[PDB]
Amino acid sequence: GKGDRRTRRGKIWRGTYGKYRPRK
């Protein structure tokens, strides 16, 4: 759901990282 700021994609499409998109 690209737009959902709280998932994998949502992040990516937003270019941010967070609990749902760690760094490594």
Partner RNA sequence: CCCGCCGUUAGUUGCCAGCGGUUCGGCCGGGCACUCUAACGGGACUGCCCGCGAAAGCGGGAGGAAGGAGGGGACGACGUCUGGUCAGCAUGGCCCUUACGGCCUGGGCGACACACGUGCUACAAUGCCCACUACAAAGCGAUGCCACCCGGCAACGGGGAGCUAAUCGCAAAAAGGUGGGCCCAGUUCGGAUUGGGGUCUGCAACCCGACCCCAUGAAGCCGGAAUCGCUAGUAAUCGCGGAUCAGCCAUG
Residues near Mg ion, by CB under 5 A: 1
| Residue 14 C-beta: closest distance to Mg ion, Å | 15
Contact 11, 18 (CB under 8 A): yes
| Residue 20 C-beta: closest distance to RNA, Å | 5
Cα dihedral sign for 1, 14, 12, 18?
Answer: negative
Site pattern 4..23 for RNA (x: CB under 7 A): xxxxxxxxxxxxxxxxx-xx
Q: What is the CA radius of gyration of the chain?
A: 7
The residues of the shown chain that bind RNA, judged by CB under 7 A, are 1-20, 22-24
